[PDB]
Design a protein around this ligand. Structure first.
Ligand SMILES: [Cu+2]
Length: 128
């Protein structure tokens, strides 16, 4: 059935969705991120990072303390279930991951880890 979603992160620090549905018949799921804004990665970079709700805060915080040089993700962070590269104005990045990494019932969160962005740039992802 459908196993993909397009998402945009813009100059206004927002994702154009705050809730993603993964159909449990999907084996793989694709996120196609784009940056339709005009500002550079060092001041308006966006990634789409997926973790459990419970892990989000640690991923965000440890990612913040890693610099831009590391795409604002802590090296070797196993809490990261899937993620795109960090992108700036005009860039795109797509990420496909295994649905076997999700479970029904649980609330996953997707978010951007650029410093601060996650106060606005976050949403839920649910398998059903
Ligand atoms: Cu961002």
């Amino acid at each position: 059935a459908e196993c993909s979603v397009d998402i945009q992160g813009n100059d206004q620090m927002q994702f154009n969705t705050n809730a993603i549905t993964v159909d449990k018949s999907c084996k793989q799921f694709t996120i196609n991120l784009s940056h339709p804004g005009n500002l550079p990665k060092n001041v308006m970079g966006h990634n789409w990072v997926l973790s459990t709700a419970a892990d989000m805060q640690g991923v965000v915080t440890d990612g913040m303390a890693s610099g831009l040089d590391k795409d604002y993700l802590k090296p070797d962070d196993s809490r990261v279930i899937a993620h795109t590269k960090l992108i700036g104005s005009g860039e795109k990045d797509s990420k496909t991951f295994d649905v076997s990494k999700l479970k029904e019932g649980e609330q996953f969160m997707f978010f951007c880890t650029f410093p601060g962005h996650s106060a606005l740039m976050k949403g839920t992802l649910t398998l059903k």
